[PDB]
Amino acid sequence: TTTPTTHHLTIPPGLTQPEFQELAHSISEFHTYQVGPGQCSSLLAQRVHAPLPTVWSVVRRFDKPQTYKHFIKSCHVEDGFEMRVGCLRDVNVISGLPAETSTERLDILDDERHVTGFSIIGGEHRLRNYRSVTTVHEYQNHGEIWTVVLESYVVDMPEGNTEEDTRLFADTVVKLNLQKLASVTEGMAR
Amino acid sequence: TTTPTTHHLTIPPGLTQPEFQELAHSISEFHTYQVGPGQCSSLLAQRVHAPLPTVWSVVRRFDKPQTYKHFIKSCHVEDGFEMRVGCLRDVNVISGLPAETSTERLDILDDERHVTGFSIIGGEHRLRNYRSVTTVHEYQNHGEIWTVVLESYVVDMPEGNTEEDTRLFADTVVKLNLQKLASVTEGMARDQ
Secondary structure, eight states: OOEEOOGGGSOOTTOOHHHHHHHHHHHHHHSOOEEOTTEEEEEEEEEEOSOHHHHHHHHTOTTOGGGTOSSEEEEEEOTTOOOOTTOEEEEEEOOSSOOOOEEEEEEEEETTTTEEEEEEEESOSSSTTOEEEEEEEEEEETTEEEEEEEEEEEEEOOTTOOHHHHHHHHHHHHHHHHHHHHHHHHHHHO | OOEEOOGGGSOOTTOOHHHHHHHHHHHHHHSOOEEOTTEEEEEEEEEESSOHHHHHHHHTOTTOGGGTOSSEEEEEOOTTOOOSTTOEEEEEEOOSSSSEEEEEEEEEEETTTTEEEEEEEEOOSSSTTOEEEEEEEEEEETTEEEEEEEEEEEEEOOTTOOHHHHHHHHHHHHHHHHHHHHHHHHHHHHOO
16 A cells, blocks of 8 residues: 555656657656555656756756746745755745745755755645655757656645545646746747 | 726736737726725736637637636536526636635626626635636737737635735736637647
8 A cells, every 4th residue: 555656657748658768767766756545646747948957957946946836926045045955945835825835845956967856844734745856858859859857746635635636736736837947948048 | 895997007918009009998898897905806918829719719618618727627517508698617626625616607708799707606715706807809910910818807815815915826827827728729720
């Protein structure tokens, strides 16, 4: 009943067959979670027609998630802020209800392998123990080069929610943010 | 006591002044709301590079809001469903909350003037007493023709929310839905 996710065995929506083949080892390396009862996890993918550094330059800005995410009113980092593993950010999210600032922790930041990740340690009460990972990759199709962004998460389902509904919400939000990420970065690359 | 919105006095973001000249009359005719305390209102615009009938044909399908809106799991209408003013739809919303369903009422449907509108009569915790209006318009400049969609709303701010935060939420949903509407309809027209 507690088993590793299998995101590396299913073509995620947003990828083609060749893209997925070339990326499955990275999916198993960076986008694997332990899912038990009362947890769910998902992988989303987005093609981005901008150079990988341009795309990574946004993905890595732990202090400015609003650069590519919707529903962010503001994001503040701490005084002695160095974008280093463990630093905390307070994200005020636009939810339509009055909400508590979301306290998030930088879990991973690898400028050579283009991997970052975070976990929500305070604020969001319903989607508890959210932890997410983003990787950025370059891909080739008969000479044509583009960037692929993979974002996954694991979360505890609130008592009284199904896996299908919790995943539907988190997937919908991630998918919209990845759309914004592509628009923002393809414009920077023009 | 309420006061009127004056959305016809502001160029909606993304539109130009000549577009606005042609549309200001429609904003005051169809997009004027009475705003009291604890309510706020907004008008959004989306340029669409597809024929007006293609855009209107999607916007008018009160029974299929998921064709152009995000965050809808499904939409249920009654069996012998008739799309006439007063008809009801039940929108099961993707919220992360359990079984949120918005019962919405068709307020307006004018296939000659391309105006539709609805209000939420129960079930949406974020958008209480939401009432919205969409108009679709044609425009031509130096020969080039495109469609302009205007969507506005009025909504109650939940107790403990500012108008700024309530409009930020509702504006974001509207603008993302208008983005989807444009993608959906520009794709239908390229397949033509």
